[PDB]
Enzyme design. Structure first.
Site, PDB file in Angstrom:
ATOM      1  N   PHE A 124      -7.509  -6.134   6.178  1.00  0.00           N
ATOM      2  CA  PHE A 124      -7.693  -6.520   4.788  1.00  0.00           C
ATOM      3  C   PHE A 124      -6.718  -7.642   4.466  1.00  0.00           C
ATOM      4  CE2 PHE A 124      -6.729  -6.401   0.288  1.00  0.00           C
ATOM      5  CZ  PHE A 124      -7.988  -6.633  -0.216  1.00  0.00           C
ATOM      6  N   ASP A 209       0.308 -10.969   8.219  1.00  0.00           N
ATOM      7  CA  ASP A 209       0.068 -10.593   6.834  1.00  0.00           C
ATOM      8  C   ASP A 209       0.931  -9.375   6.553  1.00  0.00           C
ATOM      9  OD1 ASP A 209      -0.820  -9.456   4.494  1.00  0.00           O
ATOM     10  OD2 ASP A 209      -2.944  -9.810   4.882  1.00  0.00           O
ATOM     11  N   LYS A 238       3.020  -8.155  -3.366  1.00  0.00           N
ATOM     12  CA  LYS A 238       3.156  -6.733  -3.758  1.00  0.00           C
ATOM     13  C   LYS A 238       4.611  -6.365  -4.079  1.00  0.00           C
ATOM     14  CE  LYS A 238      -1.036  -4.690  -1.738  1.00  0.00           C
ATOM     15  NZ  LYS A 238      -1.581  -4.078  -2.976  1.00  0.00           N
TER      16      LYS A 238
END
Ligand SMILES: Cc1ncc(COP(=O)(O)O)c(C=O)c1O
Ligand SMILES: Cc1ncc(COP(=O)(O)O)c(C=O)c1O
Lengths: 387, 390
Positions: A124, A209, A238
């Site tokens: 993702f 990532d 985040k």
């Protein structure tokens, strides 16, 4: 399919690892808004940074730099392999920048034909057209018209498959060191080192990532530090802003120099307000004591999960790193993760899934021991209701 | 320090703003500037507006973040405000204009796919368009220089000249899913759609069952003196995007559409903190008095620009709408917009370009008249310095 809250569950207030809804029901937060509120809700240091910078300067555009961005860039450079940083507003934007940079670097340094990107099933990377096409769930990239081409997917942790598809026309390998959404699956050491070696061999860039697994989540500042494998480009978001929308793309001077003025950009990205908040977050997370505590706290959670499994026989595996925790359901409970999540909410504890077969936990990195015990007792009660 | 720290994608002014209040900004040396740039049309209520600071602090001590699993009160309230004030029946919140446009373009594609045919994929867009710098949005954008060099672009995007309705008619067909347009192209030289062109896009989209997508990231949220530019024109799009002014400096964006279209995927997403700030921003901008004032202030700027041209013979056209102002340089000064921008900064006024031929102004929608006059005197002085050399 998707997890959505009904009309009667609307969060209105948070403090630390506790959240209240419109009806005044109190929840223990083991979800962190999907691993975002890494210092919990309304942390006093983050609130102070927000309010003080909020009185001073919020935004000037990249017609200029600003002091909070400079300070934050310096902190990231001093603490990591990075020599250059670009700030954006979301993980998706940071990944867009990383993928564009790897493409452009190959184009200008080697060949306009060196375009293949290798990525992994269940990855993702965001929901923009390009990032969702690099992501490894066809269900989510179907149905938007022609996808950006030259992206190849192979199984996570399958080094042979990577070796098989890579060549001189490959510009990048993109990988999450731990696939958070994808069942909380950690790279094996041989796989991650192997990616580094293959990228070296083919003159491709290794892109990590770390939007979910970075900024302290694993108990190191970035997961790459646990593995000792240094990527060419890394993305972070985040936890970076503790709830404020901010992201960063980290790379070297040699790679960054492939970009010229106008190669990429952002109106808001590099924001003094965002960067003041992320600076405060960074100063707390990047301390020996907080990083140690993440490991202590992980074991507190894991012991509770083990106790739940001893009583109810529901988990086949407990995995992840630091305070990214996955608990895979036994075949008897295949596809039930959403039901355990909703049961958790009924019991006053907020948890996550990582696919239909996996429970996920991503609490504040400073979650209090008392909150761990209370929330896990609530989760045990929820499990008892389901089974 | 910038060169030592950030990717070389920007060439920042040689000064570093440290503090802003209203339309004045101070650098590290305490030099005071008048801000006619607004961080590129973002700080629509100026710097550290007390109502926005209050919303930031109040929500900042309550709840910052929810995931998209949840809604939150600020997002609900902002969605309601937008729905009540516009054609929208559904609102999706994101962080940036690029993300809002990604959502809009994906939605137009997906709506066509599921409601018509998986083959209905063509997107019509315009030369000089700017829609963001993600791979998809930059490919919908109309500047090949910015979309070249990143490997294979998302396909089925066709570019024709802005304001060329015949060209749009020529390329559209039953395989067309969307026409994407900025009602005023801000980056592209501050060029406004003609009425016939914009209405024509609506009629062609109706004829071909395509969705009309208005990118109002720059021209929306009061910039033109209406809440959205589409309201000036009386042409209702199927999907509209908004950012920049929406948050007055806080990163936030929105995609507005109907229930019928949104169902292919009344609010979704939205950061509680962002939406609290955007709600306070909306409450001020969407008032008769502020919207009227945008027109008064535009004329104050334009009169100064006319006086500058009378003295120095530098502008061939003054255009835009509301407080998006473009002043095109005469042929003698072609390509030299950056020279006037730097001279402006030296004189203590922050301005923009819109390409190398056009000066651009995008001040706070509530910029005080005293600041308009002072800033434009500084700009006149800057022009004077440049023209004295040549
Ligand atoms: C690994 C990973 N990458 C990228 C993203 C996208 O980031 P955002 O949702 O902030 O745009 C997420 C979420 C994630 O878990
Ligand atoms: C018309 C238009 N669309 C989209 C964008 C992209 O917005 P952002 O830079 O916030 O991603 C900008 C800037 C713009 O002027």
């Amino acid at each position: 399919l998707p997890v959505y809250a009904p009309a009667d569950f609307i969060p209105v207030k948070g403090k630390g690892s506790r959240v209240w809804d419109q009806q005044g029901k109190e929840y223990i937060d083991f979800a962190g808004g999907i691993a975002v509120t890494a210092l919990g809700h309304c942390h006093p240091a983050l609130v102070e940074a927000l309010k003080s910078q909020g009185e001073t300067l919020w935004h000037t555009s990249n017609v200029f730099t600003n002091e909070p961005a400079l300070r934050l860039g310096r902190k990231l450079i001093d603490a990591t392999f990075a020599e250059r940083v670009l700030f954006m507003n979301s993980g998706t934007e940071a990944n867009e920048t990383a993928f564009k940079l790897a493409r452009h670097y190959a184009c200008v340094r080697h060949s306009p034909f060196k375009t293949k990107i290798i990525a992994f099933h269940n990855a993702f990377h965001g929901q923009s057209l390009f990032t969702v096409s690099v992501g490894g769930q066809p269900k989510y990239s179907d149905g938007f018209g022609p996808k950006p081409a030259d992206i190849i997917h192979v199984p996570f942790n399958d080094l042979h498959a990577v070796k098989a598809v890579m060549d001189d026309h490959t510009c990048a390998v993109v990988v999450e060191p731990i696939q958070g959404e994808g069942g909380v699956q950690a790279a094996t050491p041989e796989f991650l080192k192997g990616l580094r070696d293959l990228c070296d061999e083919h003159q491709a860039l290794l892109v990590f990532d770390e939007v979910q697994c970075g900024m302290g989540r694993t108990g190191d500042l970035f997961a790459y530090m646990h593995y000792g494998v240094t990527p060419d480009i890394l993305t972070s978001a985040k936890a970076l802003g503790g709830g404020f929308p901010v992201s960063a793309m980290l790379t070297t001077q040699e790679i960054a120099s492939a970009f010229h003025v106008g190669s990429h950009g952002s109106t808001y990205g590099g924001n003094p307000l965002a960067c003041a908040v992320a600076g405060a977050t960074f100063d707390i997370i990047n301390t020996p004591e907080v990083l140690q505590g993440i490991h202590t706290k992980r074991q507190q959670f894991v012991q509770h999960l083990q106790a739940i499994d001893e009583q109810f026989d529901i988990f086949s595996d407990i995995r992840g790193m630091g305070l990214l925790i996955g608990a895979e359901l036994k075949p008897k409970y295949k596809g039930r993760a959403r039901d355990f999540l909703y049961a958790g909410a009924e019991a006053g504890v907020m948890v996550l899934n990582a696919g239909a077969d996996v429970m996920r936990f991503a609490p504040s990195l400073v979650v209090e021991e008392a909150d761990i015990h209370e929330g896990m007792q609530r989760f045990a009660q929820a499990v008892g209701k389901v089974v």
